[PDB]
Amino acid sequence: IYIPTLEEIKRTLQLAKDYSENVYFIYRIALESGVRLSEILKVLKEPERDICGNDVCYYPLSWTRGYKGVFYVFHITPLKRVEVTKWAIADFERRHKDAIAIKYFRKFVASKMAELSVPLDIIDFIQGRKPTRVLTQHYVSLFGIAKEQYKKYAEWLKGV
User: Fold this and answer.
1) What are phi and psi of 53, to 5 degrees?
2) Computed from CA positions of residues 104, 108, 113, 117, in that sequence, does the dihedral angle turn out positive or negative?
3) Which domain holds residue 106?
4) Is 11 a catalytic residue?
């Protein structure tokens, strides 16, 4: 399957930033977090609920598709308020065929976390996906395990 290259990500961030720094910031949080666009737009409408701790930040959210459950938007950069819909994003990509669709930023994040040996069930949780197994491998302490695993992607990302 297609996983974007780091260069393809950089070029997309740059196209965005030159179009709107707000749209850019959305792609940036997409790269930092691995979560899906809808969640990124939720957290940016209420950036105050963000929680920043030392090395990384995390924004507590709750599953809406199906039974509810707590997950976190992990990121490095403190949030700022951005008010857009998915249509702002759609317009931007329609106008830039060589900008990688934001949905593919997930694939890239997932792929990198693999190379850093983040276990797949934790990659799933970091990205705001529901468990694939009823009997999860990490019953305690899920937040801690996720955070320490995420701190490895953060370090990588910080050194580019």
Assistant:
1) -130, 85
2) positive
3) 1-160
4) no
